[PDB]
Design a protein around this nucleic acid. Structure first.
Lengths: 429, 429, 429
DNA sequence: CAGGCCAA
DNA sequence: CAGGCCAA
DNA sequence: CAGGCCAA
């Protein structure tokens, strides 16, 4: 029989988009100096071990796509980031010929020059670390002497403005020529810092374990041999990275009296759970099903996360475990591996009189060429004849929310807990 | 060494039974007419799109096995339905030679004649549909003009009585000669209906998406070429279809003081959970472990579901996710695919003066031969020497119950929620 | 480029240890006699069917390793039992030449001599059984006439003292020469007992199912043909058998303000749950996530289980489902199969006048050579430069605890519930 | 040698 | 082209 | 023919 009709199904349009950027970064060869961080509120007193390995913010959307691209992508509901790849090439590493201390003849033609590469240090359960901006001494510009108050949000915002510049109506427009237009180098200021407990004021049983041997977890090469060579090549497939929420479905509550029905989930977990842990061991690990959350499209939608655009530079691209879909789903926790590259500090040719680390360093810069590609996909489903696009209600998305109404999102800024990136309340920009 | 004894284990007797029926169904080629359904209580105002695709009740036990077989199967505890298969063959489709409107000469030898087949429309998340009985206009017998109050339970009971007849003591015995004895055709009256929201009285943001293009999800063939041809051939393996509860185990509480003990389930879910969802998006999806339930055999058994025989025609055969077993079990939600077949309405040869759908249709009937087979299995375990059959306590079964004591069961009558059949309270017959 | 550094990671030292013992056991051919056990508190009145199959305590640590080895293993934190294997060889089985009843000439050269082997009877859901010590009649030394009050803890302690002897300062030192030094035979006194309900005082619907046919689940061989032959050869890989807790990690709460953070678990269960069941069917099976528990190392450690050394002879080696680790973990319930071996009772050559079981038995002993091997592994992780060994915080372990502070552990002493070994509160030694 | 721990 | 969503 | 049920 001639089939006059056949189940061709819905009309769905899938769009794949690619975002590419090229960035040139200058990195300081910061010395390895212990800095004291005083206790503040819930933060204990700790020792900080500074490094010269600059953080590469490849986990954020501004790294791959310009404000124009971001604004246009906003008009594509259902957009998911598919894969993010970054390639880092280092160029000739400059080392100061002399320290500038006139009282010594330390100038020399010879250089020992090492490049440090750190993949996934952020996820190591026992190396408590985060990326920090330092303040430096005037006599020794390469020696950290404290911490800048610049937060991670402010750092990434400043880096974005250096990448793309100001708006034409900005009075400060001339200050930052866009590196996306010029191709000029950008100074990085956000470096890996290793922390350990400070037991000087600790009462009771002190932990006196020193630092973890973090140099056993990084790669280091002779930077003289690495000129114009690829040093980092990492791809990442996103588990769940909703950049724009799905098209809202036609609400079945307007058609059906069964919208609030119940059905068996069996032994499968179709609702995600939040795990709370306590490294102080005052409380056992806790798993709580049905965390507070609300839809990011539909009649009672709360789109604060996507209207505050947390996902451009404040919050990492991948948010697996933060977002639920209303269907039989498998959801796991997610992390993007951290990338830190830098030059080891070059000691001065002075001769110190004691068996210890060098106390004076030559100025040295790492020159890193960064190639980054981001792939995204969006959908245009037509479940209904009129009224525009509508998705299936099984494509409805929820986002974890705090009880005060602030969206909860993954953050890569704080140190890991048991190798996990925490979920934290988003802050209104 | 000569083994005088070896672990031969228990004596268990497994019985496999087959139930076959042949039914001949007559289907009306109902027109596609929009019907208004006024809001009633929790049901909103909606538009109904009528079709001529008659529902095939292959998900119910009366479809395969007669009252005598059902009554005998009651005496086989531990009976599970294993597989249900249905084969549908269509015969010559009759179309009225003339409409009967004397004021027109619409009689014609020529016919355009189409058969519609719909598999799994009930499970489509975005096509809100259910099977309904219509009322028809007198001048146009093939045009629905409303809904009959006949419910799904009443419809399936009437169809069962048409299939098998009354008891010999019934005063109305002569009214329904059994089709199981005669082989005569039975008129089907339960047709697929597509629903959409009615926004005439809607206050606020209206959804004006019209209807979903449901004809993109059905098969249609020239019925003139389908004479004596198989059109539906579907098999279904039941995940969990307990027709008669297991043999009750010997209660360990009469032998042991450890009967109320606790043991680790680990990270496995050995207890099922009920998922509550809200398409109005007023409440997030909720998963609740340890839903109220009670045993269907044993000292505190509640056998209301199996004594009210919900499972004959009121409730579908498969109840996966409704029934728990006391052991390490994997349980998932279950659905039987819906089958709707019918003839598209044949327009009258009159010439209408406006660009629109036909307003008059010829009488047309689909002639469908239905072959159905049901396979069941039961067990006779002898854990003990005396007293009759007893099963292992790991074979104990629980059924979900509401707090008022009404058994909860799966139903295929209401429209799907996120592609799921709901669980609802059973009603006492 | 020449890599001056590469990620060699941590220094971790793994130590594998082997523990071997050889034991010679003498088993009585106890008669199959029904014993009444009166109701006591929560324990109902029941009938007990005695057997001669002696329990082999291969599930406990004292079976494989001496007090010196146990005390030294205490100084290896992070020790897990890996595998336990037992080989049982039976030697010539002695049968009394005569019963000693002078009023009969029952002495005979001829013997019918059978060896009974029972693997995994403890896990059978419908055979409610446990191992018991009997009291015997004076005229018939092989006939049980009651139960000794000796508990399982006391039995295993006495067997341990027979295996290894007393301390040199003990006044009772001469009473028990160590079998680990002498190689002498040890009399076993702990035999499989089959239970069934006693309905003499039962009010209401009585269960009169008799006994389960337990002889359909054991192996039996002609013991005359089994002289110097292997009869049991069983290996067991432990799922989780922590003998000494891990090295405590450096507490991140002393370094980080994020220690009490939350992260998504997704749909995975990273926290174990305890399943409570009710064979009386008064309560449905219940699964409870986040059972009370506390760490076995770290700042708030509760090491009562490992300081009371429950794991030497009071509690079985494997405790899977009792112990949690703070990470994405898969945990399941665990059981070690039971081993019971013995000689069937040899009837007297007297002629009884009634059709029934023999009422007099010859003395018979089983001679069983038991070879047992236990493999354990421990770790020495160095996450930090100073202060000694520290593990990753993902290696932190928690143990289930009751609300009163008593550690919860698996026990193989009580009869199974739905084929599961229960978790019970440990008792302070 | 990276992505929900590593000593798997 | 059906069975716990389909645009997987 | 044993290890989270066996009649899978």
């Amino acid at each position: 029989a001639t089939a006059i009709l056949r189940p061709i199904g819905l009309h769905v349009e899938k769009f794949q988009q690619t975002y590419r950027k090229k960035w040139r970064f200058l990195t300081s060869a910061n010395a390895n100096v212990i800095l004291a961080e005083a206790a503040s509120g819930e933060r204990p007193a700790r020792w900080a071990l500074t490094t010269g390995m600059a953080s590469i913010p490849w986990e954020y959307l501004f790294f791959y796509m310009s404000p124009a691209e971001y604004n246009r992508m906003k008009n594509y509901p259902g957009t998911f980031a598919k894969s993010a790849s970054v390639r880092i090439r280092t160029w000739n590493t400059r080392v100061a010929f002399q320290t500038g201390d006139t009282q010594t003849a330390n100038a020399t033609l010879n250089q020992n020059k090492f490049l440090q590469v750190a993949k996934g240090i952020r996820s190591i359960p026992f190396i408590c670390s985060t990326n920090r901006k330092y303040t430096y001494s005037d006599t020794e510009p390469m020696q950290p002497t404290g911490f800048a108050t610049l937060t991670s949000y402010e750092y990434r915002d400043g880096l974005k403005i250096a990448m793309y510049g100001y708006d034409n109506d900005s009075p400060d427009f001339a200050k930052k020529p866009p590196a996306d237009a010029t191709g000029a180098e950008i100074y990085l200021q956000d470096y890996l810092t290793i922390y350990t407990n400070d037991a000087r004021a600790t009462t009771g049983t002190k932990i006196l374990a020193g630092f973890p041997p973090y140099k056993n977890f990084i790669e280091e090469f002779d930077a003289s041999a690495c000129i114009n060579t690829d040093v980092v090549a990492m791809d990442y497939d996103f588990s769940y990275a909703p950049l724009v929420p799905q098209f809202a479905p036609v609400p079945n509550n307007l058609i059906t009296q069964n919208y609030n029905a119940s059905y068996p989930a069996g032994t499968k977990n179709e609702v995600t759970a939040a795990k709370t842990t306590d490294s102080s061991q005052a409380t056992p690990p806790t798993q709580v099903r049905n965390a507070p959350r609300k839809y990011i499209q539909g009649p009672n939608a709360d789109t604060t996360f996507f209207d505050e655009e947390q996902n451009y530079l404040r919050v990492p691209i991948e948010q697996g475990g933060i977002f639920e879909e209303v269907n039989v789903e498998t959801v796991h926790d997610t992390q993007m591996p951290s990338i830190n590259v830098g030059i080891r500090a070059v000691p001065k040719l002075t001769t110190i009189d004691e068996t210890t680390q060098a106390n004076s360093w030559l100025d040295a810069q790492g020159y890193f060429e960064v190639d980054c590609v981001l792939t995204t996909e969006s959908v245009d489903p037509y479940t209904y004849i009129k009224g525009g696009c509508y998705s299936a209600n099984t494509k409805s998305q929820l986002q974890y929310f705090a009880n005060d109404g602030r969206p909860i999102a993954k953050v890569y800024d704080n140190p890991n807990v048991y190798g996990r990136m925490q979920m934290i309340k988003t802050v209104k920009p």
